[PDB]
Amino acid sequence: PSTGVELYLDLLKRTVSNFIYQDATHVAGLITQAAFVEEARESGEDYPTVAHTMIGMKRLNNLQHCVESALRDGVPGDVLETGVWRGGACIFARGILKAYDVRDRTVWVADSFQGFPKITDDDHPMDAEMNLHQYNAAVDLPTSLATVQRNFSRYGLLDDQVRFLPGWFKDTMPTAPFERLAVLRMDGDSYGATMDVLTHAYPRLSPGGFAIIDDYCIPACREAVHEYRDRHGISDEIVEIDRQGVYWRRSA
Amino acid sequence: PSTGVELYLDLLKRTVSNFIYQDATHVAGLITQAAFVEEARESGEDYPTVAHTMIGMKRLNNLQHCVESALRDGVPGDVLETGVWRGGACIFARGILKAYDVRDRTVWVADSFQGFPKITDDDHPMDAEMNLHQYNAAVDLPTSLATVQRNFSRYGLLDDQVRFLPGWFKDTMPTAPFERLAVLRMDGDSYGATMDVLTHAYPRLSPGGFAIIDDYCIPACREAVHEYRDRHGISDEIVEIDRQGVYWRRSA
Ligand SMILES: CC[C@H]1OC(=O)/C=C/[C@H](C)[C@@H](O[C@@H]2O[C@H](C)C[C@H](N(C)C)[C@H]2O)[C@@H](C)C[C@@H](C)C(=O)/C=C/C=C/[C@@H]1CO[C@@H]1O[C@H](C)[C@@H](O)[C@@H](OC)[C@H]1OC
Ligand SMILES: CC[C@H]1OC(=O)/C=C/[C@H](C)[C@@H](O[C@@H]2O[C@H](C)C[C@H](N(C)C)[C@H]2O)[C@@H](C)C[C@@H](C)C(=O)/C=C/C=C/[C@@H]1CO[C@@H]1O[C@H](C)[C@@H](O)[C@@H](OC)[C@H]1OC
Ligand SMILES: Nc1ncnc2c1ncn2[C@@H]1O[C@H](CSCC[C@H](N)C(=O)O)[C@@H](O)[C@H]1O
Ligand SMILES: Nc1ncnc2c1ncn2[C@@H]1O[C@H](CSCC[C@H](N)C(=O)O)[C@@H](O)[C@H]1O
Numbered sequence: 270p271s272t273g274v275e276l277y278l279d280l281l282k283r284t285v286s287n288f289i290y291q292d293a294t295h296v297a298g299l300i301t302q303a304a305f306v307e308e309a310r311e312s313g314e315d316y317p318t319v320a321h322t323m324i325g326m327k328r329l330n331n332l333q334h335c336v337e338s339a340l341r342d343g344v345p346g347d348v349l350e351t352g353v354w355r356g357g358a359c360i361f362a363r364g365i366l367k368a369y370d371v372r373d374r375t376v377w378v379a380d381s382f383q384g385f386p387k388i389t390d391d392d393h394p395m396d397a398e399m400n401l402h403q404y405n406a407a408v409d410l411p412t413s414l415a416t417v418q419r420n421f422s423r424y425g426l427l428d429d430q431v432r433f434l435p436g437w438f439k440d441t442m443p444t445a446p447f448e449r450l451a452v453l454r455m456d457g458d459s460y461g462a463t464m465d466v467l468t469h470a471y472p473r474l475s476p477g478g479f480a481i482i483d484d485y486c487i488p489a490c491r492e493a494v495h496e497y498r499d500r501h502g503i504s505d506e507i508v509e510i511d512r513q514g515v516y517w518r519r520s521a
Numbered sequence: 522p523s524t525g526v527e528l529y530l531d532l533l534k535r536t537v538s539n540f541i542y543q544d545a546t547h548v549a550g551l552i553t554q555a556a557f558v559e560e561a562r563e564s565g566e567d568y569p570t571v572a573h574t575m576i577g578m579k580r581l582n583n584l585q586h587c588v589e590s591a592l593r594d595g596v597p598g599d600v601l602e603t604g605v606w607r608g609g610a611c612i613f614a615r616g617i618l619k620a621y622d623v624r625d626r627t628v629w630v631a632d633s634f635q636g637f638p639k640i641t642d643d644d645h646p647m648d649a650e651m652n653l654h655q656y657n658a659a660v661d662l663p664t665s666l667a668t669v670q671r672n673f674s675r676y677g678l679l680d681d682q683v684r685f686l687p688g689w690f691k692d693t694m695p696t697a698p699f700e701r702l703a704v705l706r707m708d709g710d711s712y713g714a715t716m717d718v719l720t721h722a723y724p725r726l727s728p729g730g731f732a733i734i735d736d737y738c739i740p741a742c743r744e745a746v747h748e749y750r751d752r753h754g755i756s757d758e759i760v761e762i763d764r765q766g767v768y769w770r771r772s773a
């Protein structure tokens with residue numbers, strides 16, 4: 270990075286993922302030690318105790334790629350992340366728009382702001398077995414709307430181009446008041462959250478727009494992706510980002 | 522802030538002072554609670570447990586003012602900080618040069634890298650009384666050269682335009698290899714450290730350059746400043762920054 274924009278976006282990635290102060294990770298899943306590990310934060314594989322995003326540098330770089338490509342190529346629409354936790358990825362998205370002085374696109378921040386949902390008999394069997402709800406406390410996942418707003422304000426990026434969609438995706442997505450998306454970033458882990466958002470938000474993704482599946486390594490997530498793509502006859506190349514995420518670019 | 526440069530430098534200030542994650546302060550001096558207090562970090566009056574600078578937002582803004590004015594006005598010379606702790610103010614200084622693609626100026630980082638010196642019989646009576654050495658561990662002040670280098674690297678700002686002057690100022694300043702300074706930032710607290718640097722570095726401060734006295738609220742520091750100014754017939758207006766620091770701009 271040499272230009273002001275390049276320096277800003279580089280620093281913003283380093284800051285939301287907190288390579289700057291390198292906070293400890295929660296101990297959960299495959300992470301058995303609390304110590305900061307560079308490689309884990311680089312590929313977004315730990316559970317930061319303090320950092321504002323857990324998606325890591327490779328998926329932040331991907332988000333930047335997708336937003337910049339949409340801007341460059343004149344792909345119409347907003348940016349939506351479904352599953353935002355402390356807000357770091359959406360903060361970075363808003364910063365990208367800020368850096369290029371884009372005044373006519375919005376970052377939509379969608380989340381229960383309550384962590385993973387309690388499982389009921391309505392849930393897909395794979396979601397029920399996985400029961401993501403059980404690790405809400407373990408990785409400090411429930412994060413209120415007020416806290417996420419607090420966090421945008423800390424980098425000076427809380428403004429009218431950031432809009433919030435509080436609630437469960439099955440409830441908020443069908444009538445969410447955006448008309449077009451240039452980037453749809455899905456990070457809700459489950460079959461349910463993935464299918465909710467593909468069903469109700471993907472049709473508003475512009476041709477040339479990007480669909481990012483953060484959690485593709487999770488079998489329930491991946492099953493929703495393939496079910497949805499099969500149903501709609503979507504054959505757009507699935508491109509791998511790191512050990513967790515993939516994306517495709519919508520051809521039509 | 523709206524340009525890439527403005528956004529970058531704004532974020533860099535917020536990051537080195539850690540308004541982003543808002544670390545606790547040490548409980549020392551007039552600070553009686555550990556909790557982050559916005560006003561205290563804004564004015565640089567606490568003792569951050571994690572942040573890379575303790576000078577606060579107002580004195581960061583002042584440093585930016587002085588460096589940008591020197592660049593704008595074509596004042597020749599490098600930037601020197603005497604007393605750098607974890608390096609945050611010097612990191613920010615390097616960032617300013619980076620933002621404007623300045624390739625012909627250096628940030629000089631001068632410190633014992635060991636905290637305040639033990640008092641000897643040679644010390645000024647006010648320094649002996651104050652005995653700053655007593656506070657080293659309490660506010661985690663001793664910070665090694667390796668750690669400071671580590672810290673610049675985290676921002677991507679460790680390069681050949683950052684040079685280090687390890688040692689006591691009375692030892693390092695008289696023969697420090699720089700020829701001219703555009704900004705001289707003094708943050709060594711004591712009569713001794715202030716007089717060391719005024720004596721041996723100030724004569725290399727260019728006309729139009731800036732002399733920043735971070736610690737002017739400390740009587741021993743202020744005593745050195747007026748003794749030095751009186752000796753050299755310096756009458757340049759002393760301008761307040763906040764409740765600790767002042768600066769003047771050199772006319773003669
Ligand atoms: C710590 C929280 C995570 O828990 C996990 O990562 C939980 C992984 C469990 C422990 C695994 O199960 C174990 O596999 C071993 C090979 C054998 C072991 N024996 C005893 C049976 C067995 O316990 C995995 C394989 C369980 C299966 C069902 C699975 O795929 C679980 C996924 C759960 C992911 C949980 C949510 O993590 C999310 O992962 C995404 C990839 C990230 O992007 C991020 O998404 C927002 C993250 O959210 C915190
Ligand atoms: C905890 C470490 C600091 O300890 C301090 O901050 C020391 C504060 C002493 C205790 C103060 O004295 C007290 O003032 C009260 C209002 C009343 C109280 N009664 C009993 C009289 C009285 O004790 C101050 C006013 C003493 C005078 C001599 C002074 O200015 C002290 C300077 C010593 C500063 C110590 C070093 O702090 C440095 O202060 C600079 C202003 C900062 O920019 C920063 O510089 C690098 C910082 O370094 C950690
Ligand atoms: N069905 C659902 N409806 C709404 N939010 C959901 C949901 N299932 C999971 N979530 C939310 O999905 C998020 C997954 S963590 C998301 C990580 C985030 N993108 C980052 O940058 O770090 C959590 O905040 C959780 O509250
Ligand atoms: N006589 C002396 N010679 C060299 N370094 C000294 C010194 N007296 C004090 N110091 C150093 O002065 C520093 C004061 S703290 C400086 C704070 C720093 N400018 C910031 O941005 O946060 C300490 O790092 C200490 O090691």
Ligand SMILES: [Mg+2]
Pocket residue numbers: 456457458483484
């Ligand atoms: Mg994920």
Ligand SMILES: [Mg+2]
Pocket residue numbers: 708709710735736
């Ligand atoms: Mg000071």
